[PDB]
Amino acid sequence: KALSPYAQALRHVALRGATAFGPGAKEMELDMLRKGTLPADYRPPVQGRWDDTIERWAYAWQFPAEEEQDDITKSVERNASGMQALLEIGNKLLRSPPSPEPLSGKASKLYPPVGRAEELSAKYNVPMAYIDDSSEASNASKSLALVMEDVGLEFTEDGLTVVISALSRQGYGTIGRAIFDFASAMGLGPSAEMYRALMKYASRRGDVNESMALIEEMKGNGITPRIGNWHELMYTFYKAKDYPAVSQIVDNMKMYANIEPNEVTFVLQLKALAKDNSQLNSLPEAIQLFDQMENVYGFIASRPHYDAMMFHLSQSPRPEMRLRCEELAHKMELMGIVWNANTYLNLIRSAQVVGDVAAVEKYLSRMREEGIPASIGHLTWAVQAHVQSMIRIDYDALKEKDESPLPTWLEHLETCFGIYELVVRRGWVMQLPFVNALLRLTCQATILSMERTPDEAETIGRFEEQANKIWNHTFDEWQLQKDVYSYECYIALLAHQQRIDEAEKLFQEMILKKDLSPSRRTYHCMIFMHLSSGEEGGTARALRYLEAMERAGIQVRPSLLKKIVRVNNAAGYKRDMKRRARRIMQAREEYLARKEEGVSFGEGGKEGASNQRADVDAEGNSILEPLAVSPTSTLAWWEKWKRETVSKHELFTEEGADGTPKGETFEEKNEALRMMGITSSFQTKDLVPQPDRQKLLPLIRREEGEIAGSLWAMDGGELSYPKDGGGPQGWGVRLWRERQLVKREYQKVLDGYRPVPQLSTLGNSVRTAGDQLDIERSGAQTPGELSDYRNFPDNRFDGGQLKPESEAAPAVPFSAELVWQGEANDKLSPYKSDEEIALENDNTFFSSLSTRRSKFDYLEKWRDMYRHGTLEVPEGPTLNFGRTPDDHKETMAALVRGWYQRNRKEPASEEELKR
Amino acid sequence: SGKLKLDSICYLALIKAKMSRGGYAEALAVGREQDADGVPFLPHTYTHLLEAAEVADDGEMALELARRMSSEQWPVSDRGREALKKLSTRHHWEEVAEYK
Amino acid sequence: PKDKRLESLHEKRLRYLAHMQMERQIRCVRENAKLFDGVENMPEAAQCRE
Amino acid sequence: KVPHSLIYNIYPYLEEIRRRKGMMAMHPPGKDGLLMPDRVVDNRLPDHL
Secondary structure: OOHHHHHHHHHHHHOOOOOOOOOOHHHHHHHHHHHOOOOOOOOOOHHHHHHHHHHHHHHHOOOOOOOOOOOOHHHHHOOOOOHHHHHHHHHHHHOOOOOOOOOOOOOOOOOOOOOOHHHHHOOOOHHHHHHOOOOOHHHHHHHHHHHHHHHOOOOHHHHHHHHHHHHHOOOOOOHHHHHHHHHHHOOOOOHHHHHHHHHHHHHHHHOOOHHHHHHHHHHHHOOOOOHHHHHHHHHHHHHHHHOHHHHHHHHHHHHHHHOOHHHHHHHHHHHHHHHOOOOOHHHHHHHHHHOOOOOOOHOOOOHHHHHHHHHHHHHOOHHHHHHHHHHHHHHHOOOOOOOOHHHHHHHHHHHHHHOOHHHHHHHHHHHHOOOOOOHHHHOOOOHHHHHHHHHHHOOHHHHHOOOOOOOOOOHHHHHHHHHHHHHHOOOOOOOHHHHHHHHHHHHHHHHHHHHOOOOOHHHHHHHHHHHHHHHHHHHHHHOOOOOOHHHHHHHHHHHHHOOOHHHHHHHHHHHHHHHOOOHHHHHHHHHHHHHHHOOOOHHHHHHHHHHHOOOOOOOOOOOOHHHHHHHHHHHHHHHHHHHHHHHHHHHHHHHHHHHHHHHHHHHHOHHHHHOOOOOOOOOOEEEEOOHHHHHHHOOHHHHHHHHHHHOOOOOOOOOOOOOOOOOOOOHHHHHHHHHOOOOOOOOOOOOOHHHHHOOOHHHHHOOOOOOOOOOOOOOOOOOOOOOOOOOOOOOOHHHHHHHHHHHHHHHHHHHOOOOOOOOHHHHOOOOOOHHHHHHHHHOOOOOOHHHHHOOOHHHOOOOOOOHHHHHHHOOHHHHOOHHHHHHOOOOOOHHHOHHHHHHHHOOOOOOOOOOOOOOHHHHHHHHHHOOOOOOOOOOOOOOOOOOOOOOOOHHHOOOOHOOOOOOHHHHHHHHHHHO | OOOOOOHHHHHHHHHHHHOOOOHHHHHHHHHHHHHHOOOOOOOHHHHHHHHHHOOOOOHHHHHHHHHHHHOOOOOHHHHHHHHHHHHHOOOOHHHHHHOO | OOOOOOHHHHHHHHHHHHHHHHHHHHHHHHHHHHOOHHHHOOHHHHHHHO | OOOHHHHOOHHHHHHHOOOOHHHHHHOOOOOOOOOOOOOOOOOOOOOOO
């Protein structure tokens, strides 16, 4: 349930009465043991310390390990004064190098003193920086060591690695390189870890060439690269969006470098496989790599392994991969690794891709129970869950029910715009993926409104207005810059609207001006927009987009190829319409020419039929003439309708809006039939029989055969009827099998899979005559209307006629006005924090806590308020259900007083003010 | 206009159409419309827009145009050289700023 | 009672109270037509004709 | 692997046969060094534009 922990505490006390604030169960067992009245099946608390040891063992099986890392590098980076002193010394070393010189090194003010070396460093194995000969280099090393003592380091091989890495993580490539060169020149040798701290700058920046140059430099200096250098090279290729290169480095490190992988190697490999789109098999390769790490290598998966695996498993909307993600989260919480914001984010990512808003709301409600605050990205993926739920509405069942999906779309819009109003009320900094998720929501709502309800133009207009409001004003409101996904959603919107020039304009403005690399989805949109358009050369431009996908490294999936073939075969109809419209316009121009030249007036005179009569041949003999048909027949009327009506070229003067002939819509069809003298019985598509809605008839046609038979009969021989002899081909077996199929359908009716059928004449004539009298006096069509006629005798009129459904109003109970009953129908309560709900409900001292908010904090506060005795609690459960069949009556009988006092003391306090 | 990503040549034909009717003040608005659309400026665009600043006497408009040619390093046409020498005589803006 | 989640419950309560008032009116007018309109068929000719 | 790459004759399944190699390594470099193939304008832009 999506209840707040304040509402959960209120429901807890409503369920348990005053016993929740009394003694616990263990105290009741202690009192029953001390008084002597304890039954035999109860476990006696005979020893306190041994039961404490038992509980500590059972809780130590779930106790989390300490994963906090006391990083010296982060502690140096948080020290601003030491970082400024290191930047000063690095700038002094970079602008002017010191002099490796003997005495009178005090000649410059750059390296002041603070209070035989070349062979001394070679004889006694002492580095050159550790020997003080009163030099500029000695004073520089003294100032550097004096600064490094203030940040906690030691001025050794390991301290300068921390110095170079902490400089490299904040930019400062040349400064850290100058400190590295001064360290390597002064005896402190260039180890592989100092090269790793150098490569951290290129890995954070994402520069592949600098990292490879540092690898070749440390290879040229005679230092074998260890596993940390290959780890930073893998992180450099990961930060530069080259994901299979990480697997290539892992393969070559195992093959050629002969270095066994650590757990960080598996972590970086799973992080690269989570975003790898080079091949199709990234998810089974990640599954097999996790299995090989756990079972073969013998490593135990920690939180980075579980996070990198669940982030990759949350992207697949298959239910087995979602089940794997749920089982991995459950094994994580079972092995003593508590859930954090990344774990709940991965669970929301796994639940959003299938369109499950209930699971996302359950995760958002569970996240605020343990005190974990919701970030912005949880709300972004909740909006994306609303997007995928609008995607996966089964619209065919709504077409069977004749229900518009419009209020569901309006609810999905209103919930996410309530979230957007929530994130500006908490003072949060607005992020780009939140506005991108809102734009995706509005563009997807516009696409679904164009697909499902095409005749509702005002709905599509309002959706396009909201989409253009988000695209034009909202990105510039929060000073945000548009990215590849924001262009992707709007390009998909413009591609569904067949606005090809605007989509290509935004495409080349994204590519040329903003230098953004388009994703695979927005390439698929430009492919399918040109494929679906029936104009000439759309295939030739879709192949240009395919070439641009091929030569830029964009993945070409086989599903893309099959969809290209399917979309081209589907848009063949539009291509043939746009090809036939040109011949239609040619024939229209030729008809308008030849009706003014007057050749049809000369061609209307049948001089050949007058000279060569129907009874006289070319030579003069008498030939056989067929007899004239009756003019009351259908064929004679069809020939008269062919001859007397208007021409095919006078129906429409202009053609359609986009290359197609007119007559596709029903207004043009009805106008053309009015010009042909035909009043159509089917004006709109509501008066269309729609044989795809049939359920019993195709079931009969599939198994047994055609139940009609004489539906398609030309002259009386194309009818499918059973034989007259009998046996297995006779009427009895066929009627028995039809009755068995109708019995299967009626069993589906009884189990609630099918709607209740209306009252038939055969069903009414076999009923009890009193039921027939009630049906003929009430006018009931369904037996549910007859049940409403009998169970509500005061609803009918004075002539026994049945009243409509809108004239009845049931009694609304006050127990729907509860807090937990109000949070279940709010549709914004999982997206609200504890403080917002406590402000909305009470906003007094009773809901104020004085910072962690949970259910048990409210229970511990209200227990102390009860024993003081500032809180009065009624004894007994005021919320009763599950025990007796009449429990809501006992629930309402226990809540009349509090609800009436809540509704009557506020006018009493109002009239106490003496207005 | 709104659907197609038009070129500087497509903007140039609108500049030549405005200047044919004496719309030299309106021809500078086409250059501001080309700058707002993100279409860059070519040397034939500077040739006709500096001629539009002659009749309109828009010396402040040609101040931004002449500074943009030096930053983009375009070759100046013979019709654009005489347009800059006429406006530097009237307004005396090149002599007080030392830009030649 | 002054909460922004309780408007539809107030609309349904207004519908229920108006249905109860219309049902009480229908019941009392039907009672008046059951106890006293039976004498309309047996009424005198003078009171009907005037 | 994916199972449909093991039984069906579609040509990008040939991408599934070879080992994973870097996209900067398979594509030719630029003037500065290794470069992603989607960062050069002439590759990502189609020829009709």
